[PDB]
Structure formats: structure tokens, C-alpha cells
Amino acid sequence: PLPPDITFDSLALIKMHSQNMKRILEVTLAKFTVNLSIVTVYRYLTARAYKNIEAEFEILKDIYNIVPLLDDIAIKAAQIEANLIKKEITLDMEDIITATTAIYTNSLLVTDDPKRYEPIRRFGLDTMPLDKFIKEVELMVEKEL
């Protein structure tokens, strides 16, 4: 079926947490534990702003487990990022911390662009395409009838 722990990157989260996708989000939150890095949250807030950002952030803190950039995350990310730099692979800081935080929390990373995280999978990251995730929740919605 699907693991109980998941996460999103900022672009995927902007999609999931829209007014538009309300129904799909409601089911996702009823069924899964969602562990977001604080860096994902901040990037989501940047999109939601462009506001009463403050009130939006209180909503998010209620409904998601917001994971700080912990020392062990910084450490593990520095190790991963040193490997990626070794291969001339450029992912920005957001992507590295997002991926390391998913490794840390054993959360499946749902993203519209799994391919760019592919080189991190060797450090324990797993990913799922967002279109596929959405399709799976859409079936649950149908099934509720």
C-alpha cells in the first residue's frame, strides 16, 4: 500500500496544501504521518507569502511534525553533500536538507521531481512521484464513495 511516514518537498507541499487540493490533503493527513523539514516549511511560506504568514505557520505546526535542522541532520547532510560535490552534482541546500531529514525520519519523500534526488538514494532516501501519490489518494477518495 504505502508507508505510514511521508514527507514532501516545498514544490510538492505548495501543491498539496493549496485551497484547490483540500480534499486530497484531508485524506493524506487522515492516513499518513507527515514529517516536514523546517526548510520545507520556510520555502512553502515564501510561496504563501508572495500575508499573515504567522497564522499560516501556526496551522502547519498543528498538522505536521516540523523537524528542525538538527545537529545530526547537519552532520549527515555535510557528509552527503561532500559526496555530491565529489561527483560534481549540484543540488541546492534545500534539497540536501530535505533529503537528509527524510533519511533521518525514515519518511518517504514525495516529490514532482524524484530524479534530482536520485544520487541521495544511496544514503537511504526513498522517493515517490507526487502524481503517483495523488493518484493513490484519489482512489481512496473514490473508495470512501
Added chain:
Amino acid sequence: PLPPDITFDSLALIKMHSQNMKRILEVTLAKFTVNLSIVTVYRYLTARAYLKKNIEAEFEILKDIYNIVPLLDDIAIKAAQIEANLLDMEDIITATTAIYTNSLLVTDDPKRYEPIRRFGLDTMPLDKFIKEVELMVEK
């Protein structure tokens, strides 16, 4: 023109930890409070990891001398506000953390943070910072 609270971005922090800079860092740690963003710490650890140093230990060494500032709620909120008006994430968080802590941001490249100045950031090029500290050495 140095205040009691200062911070560095990651390239500056790396330079600060070089052997030739040991005196400058010693004065800085003795006479100022240095408030680093966790993101700056992560980038610095990246540099040390790329050179195969003991990352765990180095983190503990840093935690013992710096005030390491998490990406706090208020920092996340303020940073999003800044980024939405206007630079990568490291730059935004570094600067927002500087604003939050009221630390002077000491950097190799002040000009890239020039757009955050409207939200209250103060910056200083590292070259000038070092001169000011050189002066304190003469004591």
C-alpha cells in the same frame, strides 16, 4: 564599528578557522558573542567533511564556542517575508538570523546581501573586520 554580537557567513567562518587566522579568532571569541545560523554550521561542516575530518567532533568543538541558532519559528517567518519580496536559501537564512540576533554580518561578499539591507541587516566586509580586530590586538 564592531558591535557586541557578530556573525559570519560560511566562507567567512571557514577563513576564520584557518591556522593563519588563529589570533584573529581568539580575539573575536574573547571579546564578542558570535551567533551562527545552523545553516552556516552545516556549510562549514561540509568543508570539513570534504577534507575527511571528524565531523562529529568538529560540531561539538563549534557548539562549545558559538551560539548556534536554529532555524527558529520567527526566523522561518521573517525569512519567508524577506525572500517573497526579493540569493540562495543559505544567504536568506544567514541574513535573517543576523537581523534576529542583531548581529553584524561579516562576509567576503557584502554586496550580495545588499538587498536585505532594507529589512535591517548590517554587514561588514571581512577585510575590514580583520583590520578592526588587528587594532584590538595592539591593545
